[PDB]
Design a binder for this molecule. Sequence first.
Ligand SMILES: CCC(C)(C)[C@H]1C(O)=C(C2=CS(=O)(=O)c3cc(NS(C)(=O)=O)ccc3N2)C(=O)N1Cc1ccc(F)c(C)c1
Length: 557
Amino acid sequence: HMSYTWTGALITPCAAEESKLPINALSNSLLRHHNMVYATTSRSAGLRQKKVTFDRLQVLDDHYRDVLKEMKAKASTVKAKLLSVEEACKLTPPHSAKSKFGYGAKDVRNLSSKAVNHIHSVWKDLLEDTVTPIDTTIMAKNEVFCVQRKPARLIVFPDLGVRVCEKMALYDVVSTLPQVVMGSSYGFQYSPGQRVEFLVNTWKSKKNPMGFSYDTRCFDSTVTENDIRVEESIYQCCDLAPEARQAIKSLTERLYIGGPLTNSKGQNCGYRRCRASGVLTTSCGNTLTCYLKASAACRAAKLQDCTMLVNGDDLVVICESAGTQEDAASLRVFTEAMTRYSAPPGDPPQPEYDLELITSCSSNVSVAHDASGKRVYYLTRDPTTPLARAAWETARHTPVNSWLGNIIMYAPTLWARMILMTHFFSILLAQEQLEKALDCQIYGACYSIEPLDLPQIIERLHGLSAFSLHSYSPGEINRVASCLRKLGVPPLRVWRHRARSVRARLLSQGGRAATCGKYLFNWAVKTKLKLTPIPAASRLDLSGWFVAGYSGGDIYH
Ligand SMILES: CCC(C)(C)[C@H]1C(O)=C(C2=CS(=O)(=O)c3cc(NS(C)(=O)=O)ccc3N2)C(=O)N1Cc1ccc(F)c(C)c1
């Protein structure tokens, strides 16, 4: 029952990997402690292999089967459709990994005969053969962090042809089934403004609230053959075309439950018997499995008025407190149940009696005040990793612009507004790239976004108050200041100064640019402009935003 077996062949790169922060003329204006920032490489892959390789044991009781029966009954109400080849081709990111079979993602998107013909052949094979393990490639992710040094995370994914077939069989299912099965507990249905409302409303609904986050140790490696067969039994409760059923069964037996791991040089690295990080069903499978195990563990622990919020492997629970000693004992029971279900913790969970000290999806609730002095809740995080990734992106073009996803999702925060907005609008002005669309990821899917659309995007995701917040909390302010000292980032007084310049430049461009100057940087001037609802906000097509999660899913929206 091991998560992986290995041959000793190395996990190899496909191009040169940099680990040191690249430096250019713009670097010092953001961050001086360059030696604090690094990127992960295949050189640490071996250390990750060791961490992710362990035996799983799993004891399944009546609570587990009781929840699973309920989830199944809800899933039975879902009707899901097959996508056409052309619809699935349109969901492929332009820069997705090319096929081993002589075509690329651009050929897929174009519906080129070589690509479409091969995809039809993979589909036929999937319908005919429900036994043969499907090949996957294993690679080390290159991700940027601040020291305090993580080994590379691994990514495991099938060929591009197979990925298009996954979409055809399962895109509609994984996009629709989780919210039906899980209701308000499915986290990927929420925009940031919706997510903070749900946490606060939930917290407020309890007489004496308690909450905690649950950190599963290497969630993907804890997912067993049982878990993945249970996921398929849930998918199969849906009302589906017979062709879709056969494809889902085949994909489950041949790809999702396990298969051979091949490096970038074509050598066999070993064999996987746990979740693949780079398949379409990674997010939905992890969310269903986490929810099943956590709901059952809640019943085992006798938690009172229990609300869960689940985004894949990310779990928070808010419930009724029963006193500090019994809460501590209940959380032990919960952790023991989870452990018996094959989901033991990394960090053991702690009860918290302050909403603002709970982290979920790498974020906590904090409070600031709008133009009328009215309290507004918003989600924030420690800015260290966002700012390290921004320093890197200041000197290197990358396929995903973390800075842009961070402005979008953390737009209300003092650090996104003062540092990220200022710094990157400066760069776009100087380079005359204000109109250039950039790719970034939200809930695992890729979006191409125009930075001049940012004000309307932010009004939709957060409301107009995102542009007037002030009087942020002392905890939040100190956590930012602490980060700036650590990374060597100029203090906020300098940022306010630069923001005025940036704002004046943007207003001097007219049009969409001036709207960015007006809304995004109203905080930097004492003589304020009046900020009214933006007409363009009402016409923005944000469909496909905040419907589901697609981590590893190879989705472009
Ligand atoms: C720029 C996007 C950002 C900030 C990273 C953004 C984002 O996209 C993810 C995010 C992306 S994801 O890849 O779908 C994913 C996968 C898994 N686990 S798994 C592998 O099992 O699916 C767990 C969590 C998760 N969350 C995230 O948590 N963000 C923070 C965040 C989230 C919600 C929110 F309201 C605010 C304000 C900020």
